[PDB]
Every structure is written in C-alpha cells, then in structure tokens.
Design a protein around this ligand. Sequence first.
Ligand code: HEM
Ligand code: HEM
Lengths: 145, 145
Amino acid sequence: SVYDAAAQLTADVKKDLRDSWKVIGSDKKGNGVALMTTLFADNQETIGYFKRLGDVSQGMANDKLRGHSIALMYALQNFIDQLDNPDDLVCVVEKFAVNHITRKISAAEFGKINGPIKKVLASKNFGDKYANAWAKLVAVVQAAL
Amino acid sequence: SVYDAAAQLTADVKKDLRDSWKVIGSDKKGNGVALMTTLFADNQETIGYFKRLGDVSQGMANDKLRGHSIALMYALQNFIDQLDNPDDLVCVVEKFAVNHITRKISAAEFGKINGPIKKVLASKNFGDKYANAWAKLVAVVQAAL
Ligand code: HEM
Ligand code: HEM
C-alpha cells in the first residue's frame, strides 16, 4: 500500500519537492513553527492532540512547541533525503507512522497538514504546483495510517 | 540538570562534534545500522526494548531496523544543528527524551550507546578525543531522562 502511494512520486514531483525544500528546510525552527501555528489556527480541533505542549498560543516562545516543531522538520528532511530509493522511503515512513498510529491519528486527520504546508510554501512564493507535490508526499504517509 | 549539562559543551567540544559528524553523518543508513548492531552485540540485554523490530540479527535486511537506524541518525543531525543555540538544543533534547522516558529508558541505560559510538568513531579514524566529545553530548540527554 505504501509502496503503491510512493509510485505517485514521479521524477517531476521529486524535483519540485527537493527544490522547495531547499528553501523551506533552510529555516527549520522558523518554518516548523509557522506550520504548527497555522495548523492550530486553521483547524483548532487538532490542538486536542497537543495538551503536553501547554500554551500553544505563545508560538515560538513556547519551548515545548518550538522543540516539537524543529523535530517535525527533521522528519521531512529524512523523507526528502530518501526520495531516490523507494525501499528506504517506505521503511522510514512506516517507522514514522508507528507513533502516530498509537496516538490514534487517522489518515484524514493527518491530511489536515496540507493546508498549512500550502500556505507556508506560498509565503515563500511556491505556488500550487509545489503544493500538489507535497500533497503527494503526505499521501505516502497517509497510506501507512 | 539539562541546562547545566548543556553548558558543558565548550567551544572545542562543539568543534570536534562537527568535524566527526561531517564524516559519520555522511552515511546515515550505514553508520546508523552499524551503531545499532554494535549496541545489540555489546549489550544483549537491551534487545528486549526493541521487540517490535523483530529479528535484529538480520541487520540491514531488517526493514524495521533499517528504518529505526536512519531515524536515529536524524536525531543526532538535529542535535548537531542546534549546537549554536543552547536554548534550542535544550528544547530539542527534552522533546526527544519524552518518548524514551515513556519506555522507561534510564540515563544509565541510554549511556550504553557510548560504547557503540566510540567503536564506530574509531572505525573512521576518530579516537578518544572524539568519543569523549560525544559522551558529553550524550550526557545532555542523560540529564533529561
Ligand atoms: C508532515 C506532518 C507531520 C510530521 C512531519 C510530523 C512529525 C512528528 C515528529 C517527528 C514527532 C516526534 C516523534 C514522535 O513522537 O512520533 C511527532 C509527534 C507528534 N505528532 Fe506528528 N507530524 C506531522 C503531523 C501531525 C499531525 C497532523 C498531528 C495531529 C493531528 C500530529 C500529532 C503528533 C503528536 C500528538 C505528537 C506528539 C507531540 C508531543 O507531545 O510532543 N502529527 N510528529
Ligand atoms: C544516540 C542515541 C539514541 C538516539 C539518537 C535515539 C533515537 C531514537 C529515535 C529518533 C527514535 C524514534 C522516535 C521515537 O519513537 O522516540 C527512537 C526510538 C526508540 N529508542 Fe532511542 N535513541 C538512542 C538510544 C536509545 C537507547 C540506548 C535505547 C535503549 C537501550 C533506546 C530505545 C528506543 C526504543 C525502544 C525505541 C522504539 C523502537 C521502535 O519500536 O521502533 N534508544 N530512538
């Protein structure tokens, strides 16, 4: 199932992913927090999964939120680095899904991160073309949930 | 405390961590697996914590082990990248510790990784100087467990 989803990651998709990541991944703390705060602003219900982070309204200033946001970006860094070898991408994605499955995060719920990604990309001037590429990567993870 | 341990990362310690990581971090899949296989060989008692990975002796051929090993290297990548800002290093370390605390991994248990790191470092021509530098980094995580 995950292998099949990985099949949608074509040469053009992987190229747009790497190109956009070169910019987005250059400021992990800044963009990581931007992603999380956008998620919470657009889909307030998702906050229920993050009680441990405390007062998420503090954004960057919240050490726990900042710490989680940075770690999140290194997962994406991992995914991007494994794009040229489906076997490694798959094992890394499945490894990654384990904890989210335990937290009872469904594929539909996980898909809520697409809006935030689209907006973060746009803030850096990466249009719909890139947004669609990232939706495909997220789709690989969704297949593992 | 983790704050006091983080202050032990002096200028030269940070430099030796970077110089050595530049090499070790070049092959995350290869060195990550070697790191885990060495841990399981020198400390068989830790294998119990990794029941989910299945047959750990298969090494590289074990998809779950390969996935975990890669993820492990990106956590180290994360730590290395945060060396410039103590505040960020701390929040990333505490975030990382959460899951290990949940699995009941004590500071003494975590410290067993020092052996494997020293051996991998040595296999790449990095001696005691570097192994001790990494022990310092590991000690930051230990202070958070
Ligand atoms: C591309 C998007 C995402 C990435 C790359 C990502 C990455 C991560 C990473 C690396 C961790 C830390 C390791 C772990 O405990 O598994 C984590 C933890 C977590 N993730 Fe995800 N995640 C994403 C989206 C989501 C979404 C959409 C939700 C919620 C609806 C979610 C909920 C959680 C929770 C609850 C934790 C634990 C937070 C804490 O208490 O520190 N994740 N995620
Ligand atoms: C250089 C030291 C280490 C690093 C950087 C590291 C890194 C990681 C990472 C990134 C994960 C995946 C995210 C998560 O679930 O928290 C993890 C999982 C885990 N770690 Fe650590 N770890 C280290 C040492 C250890 C040691 C020494 C033990 C136990 C003796 C341990 C036990 C575990 C276990 C049981 C898991 C879950 C494995 C699975 O079910 O896939 N870790 N670790």
